[PDB]
Design an enzyme around this catalytic site. Structure first.
Site, mmCIF file in Angstrom:
data_model
loop_
_atom_site.group_PDB
_atom_site.id
_atom_site.type_symbol
_atom_site.label_atom_id
_atom_site.label_comp_id
_atom_site.label_asym_id
_atom_site.label_seq_id
_atom_site.Cartn_x
_atom_site.Cartn_y
_atom_site.Cartn_z
ATOM 1 C CG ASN A 1 -0.521 -0.084 2.422
ATOM 2 O OD1 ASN A 1 0.553 0.580 2.916
ATOM 3 N ND2 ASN A 1 -1.021 -1.058 3.231
ATOM 4 C CG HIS B 1 1.570 -3.731 4.761
ATOM 5 N ND1 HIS B 1 1.204 -2.955 3.436
ATOM 6 C CD2 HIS B 1 2.397 -3.160 5.512
ATOM 7 C CE1 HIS B 1 2.491 -2.066 3.580
ATOM 8 N NE2 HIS B 1 2.997 -2.137 4.849
ATOM 9 C CG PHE C 1 4.017 -8.280 0.757
ATOM 10 C CD1 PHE C 1 3.077 -7.356 1.020
ATOM 11 C CD2 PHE C 1 4.652 -8.835 1.649
ATOM 12 C CE1 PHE C 1 2.814 -6.864 2.075
ATOM 13 C CE2 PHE C 1 4.205 -8.420 3.070
ATOM 14 C CZ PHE C 1 3.318 -7.133 3.148
ATOM 15 C CG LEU D 1 5.559 -5.477 7.102
ATOM 16 C CD1 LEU D 1 5.524 -6.260 5.845
ATOM 17 C CD2 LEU D 1 5.939 -3.831 6.924
#
Lengths: 164, 11
Positions: free
Chosen positions: A101, A125, A112, A121
């Site tokens: 993003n 995400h 990914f 993350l």
């Protein structure tokens, strides 16, 4: 039933094999539906003929830019961008499928596949699936990466679609 | 650093 999708990946026109992915439609339906429709190409666009533009060993392999092929583009099946559905699913380890993003609520088509636990993350995400089969193929994509992300070979998604 | 972004790639 959670969709079962495939990515057929090649390196410099040589096949690497198939990556089978389960999309957690039971947790993130809207995120799963976007990725599933881009695999089939039913909306008139998608991942077929696109690349893994950024690959970093011991981290992740990034793809989804079917518009510009360099991270600057891509689009969702809903429009240009769509909101972060939830952060229920975590980046628990290698094989995690998560959305790339440009900050909060800027999901498009870039995703990914992790090659390590990317727990830094979590909450930033949207994780929407995982590798069912072809982690050996993901490790092959990883071997063509570098510290900068630049790929040593053109990594192309030659074919993609839905199995069930 | 170790990010997955779309537009401004960071360290």
């Amino acid at each position: 039933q959670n969709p079962l999708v495939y990515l057929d990946v090649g390196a410099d026109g040589q096949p690497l094999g198939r990556v089978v992915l389960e999309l957690k439609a039971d947790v993130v339906p809207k995120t799963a539906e976007n990725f599933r429709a881009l695999c089939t190409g039913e909306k008139g666009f998608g991942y077929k003929g696109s690349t893994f533009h950024r690959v970093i060993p011991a981290f992740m392999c990034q793809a989804g830019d079917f518009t510009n092929h360099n991270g600057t583009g891509g689009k969702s099946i809903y429009g240009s961008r769509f909101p972060d559905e939830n952060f229920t699913l975590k980046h628990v380890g290698p094989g995690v499928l998560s959305m790339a993003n440009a900050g909060p609520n800027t999901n498009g088509s870039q995703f990914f596949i992790c090659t390590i636990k990317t727990d830094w993350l979590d909450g930033k995400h949207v994780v929407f699936g995982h590798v069912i089969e072809g982690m050996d193929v993901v490790k092959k994509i990883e071997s063509f990466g570098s510290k900068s992300g630049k790929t040593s070979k053109k990594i192309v998604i030659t074919d993609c679609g839905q199995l069930s | 650093x170790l990010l997955v972004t779309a537009x401004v790639v960071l360290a």
